[model samples]
Target: KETAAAKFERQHMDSSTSAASSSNYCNQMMKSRNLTKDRCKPVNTFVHESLADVQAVCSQKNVACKNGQTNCYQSYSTMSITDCRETGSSKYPNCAYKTTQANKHIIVACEGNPYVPVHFDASV
Candidate 1:
């Protein structure tokens, strides 16, 4: 079983290089990351910050999550991020995407003994 932290990293982290500039970034990434399996992921994000920096967000200001959980924390600095929104015409095997790059404070939920990011809540 994949841990939540592993899942979070798979879906959100992309710190190797700034690859969000390409028009095909989302189209390629979402597919490689397996987010375009059965259906086009309607909305997803990839953080381009270092893993350590994002991990530090677990110690930032606590905030209520979408589900009203208070385990969420917001990063103090705006990190490079890419939001992948599936186009309206997207289909299962033909998943399409619109990539929007931005510098925004990210929010994530942390848990477990090591206290790592388990869920990416949103960005602001």
Candidate 2:
């Protein structure tokens, strides 16, 4: 089974490149990353930072998660990230997405004995 931390890394971490020029980035990545298998993920944000920096968010100030969970934390520094949002015409198994890159502080939900991010809540 994939650990929560590992899942977070797979879905949200992308430190290799900062190329936001590609308009199809989300459409391709959402599928390549396995987020389009079951159904399109309505919204997701991929942080363009080192895994260490992303994980450090767990130690930041606590905030309410999207689900109202209290384990969420907001990043202290603005980060480079790509926001993927499903387009209105999107259909399952043929998901379409709008890709946009921005610099913002991200909010994430963290958990486990090791204390690491498990879910990306949003970017602000």
Q: Count the backbone clashes (under 3 Å) in each candidate.
A: 0, 0
lDDT of 1 at 50: 91
Predicted structure 1: clash tally: 0
Q: Which ten residues in a row have the lowest lDDT in candidate 2?
A: 13-22
List clashing residue pairs in candidate 2.
none
The model with the greatest TM-score is 1
lDDT of 2 at 33: 87
Cα deviation at 120, candidate 2, in Å, is 0.8
TM-score of each: 0.96, 0.91
C-alpha lDDT (0 to 100) for residue 77 of candidate 1: 90
Q: Which residue pairs in candidate 1 have backbone atoms (N, alpha carbon, C) closer than 3 angstroms, thus clashing?
A: none
Deviation from native of the Cα of residue 95 in model 2, angstroms: 1.4
